[PDB]
Design a protein around this ligand. Structure first.
Ligand SMILES: Nc1ncnc2c1ncn2[C@@H]1O[C@H](COP(=O)(O)OP(=O)(O)OP(=O)(O)O)[C@@H](O)[C@H]1O
Ligand SMILES: Cc1cn([C@H]2C[C@H](O)[C@@H](COP(=O)(O)O)O2)c(=O)[nH]c1=O
Ligand SMILES: [Mg+2]
Ligand SMILES: [Mg+2]
Length: 209
């Protein structure tokens, strides 16, 4: 019985990391075998280049950085397939959707070109989108000094996310991320339990193909 592949997406400060940590904790406490993954995975060679870029310690050509973000997902595919095959549900904090939405927010980047590198990745069984007004997301303290940490860019990224949500091949679920940490968590936990129990009857799919 394979594990489910659950992705959490949303703009910066939507609560993705907090909810991904709480979800794994709750699933494990309820007897599931579940583990947390995140993208970018900054521990690899590629992940280190990505981290320097995001921190503005380095500059990288836009197409190149887009391809490094996708390569950082592919390098984890053998691990993802192994874990899911062993029955381990994986909770992923950002995935290909963030990749497309952030690069697609830049000038002269078509959604189509941005999607291609991630075509064929393991297809999530559930994609949770943590919806929150950008204003309230900004009021979750203040902007940091990392790349993309500004309102106009966040708004273009959000528009790209909405284009991706038209894709009916994917099991998108909207989450009202404006509620408390515990209320949002319960919403996410119940959706995840349902996906683990019913979405896994079919083989792992391939993204965007
Ligand atoms: N439901 C919530 N209500 C209020 N604050 C929240 C809520 N969820 C998370 N936060 C707070 O908002 C901040 C950002 O949360 P978190 O790190 O989980 O977001 P994120 O989506 O991972 O952000 P990033 O996009 O930068 O990685 C944290 O200080 C966190 O405690
Ligand atoms: C996974 C991923 C994240 N990003 C961005 C979103 C965030 O602004 C940034 C840091 O992510 P984080 O908010 O998860 O720490 O990286 C990309 O631009 N492309 C990607 O493929
Ligand atoms: Mg985070
Ligand atoms: Mg084509």
């Amino acid at each position: 019985r394979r594990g489910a592949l659950i992705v959490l997406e949303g703009v910066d400060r939507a609560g993705k990391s907090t909810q991904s940590r709480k979800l794994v904790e709750a699933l494990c406490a309820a007897g599931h075998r579940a583990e947390l993954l995140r993208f970018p995975e900054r521990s690899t060679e590629i992940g280190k280049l990505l981290s320097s870029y995001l921190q503005k310690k380095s500059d990288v050509e836009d197409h190149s950085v887009h391809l490094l973000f996708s390569a950082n997902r592919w390098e984890q595919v053998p691990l993802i397939k192994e874990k899911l095959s062993q029955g381990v549900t994986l909770v992923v904090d950002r995935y290909a959707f963030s990749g497309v939405a952030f690069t697609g927010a830049k000038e002269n980047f078509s959604l189509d070109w941005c999607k291609q590198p991630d075509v064929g990745l393991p297809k999530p069984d559930l994609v949770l989108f943590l919806q929150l007004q950008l204003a309230d997301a900004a009021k979750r303290g203040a902007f940091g000094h990392e790349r993309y940490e500004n309102g106009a860019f966040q708004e273009r990224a959000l528009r790209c996310f909405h284009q991706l949500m038209k894709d009916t091949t994917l099991n998108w679920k909207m989450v009202d991320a404006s509620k408390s940490i515990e209320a949002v968590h319960e919403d996410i936990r119940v959706l995840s339990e349902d996906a683990i129990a019913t979405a896994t009857e079919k083989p792992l799919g391939e993204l965007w193909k």
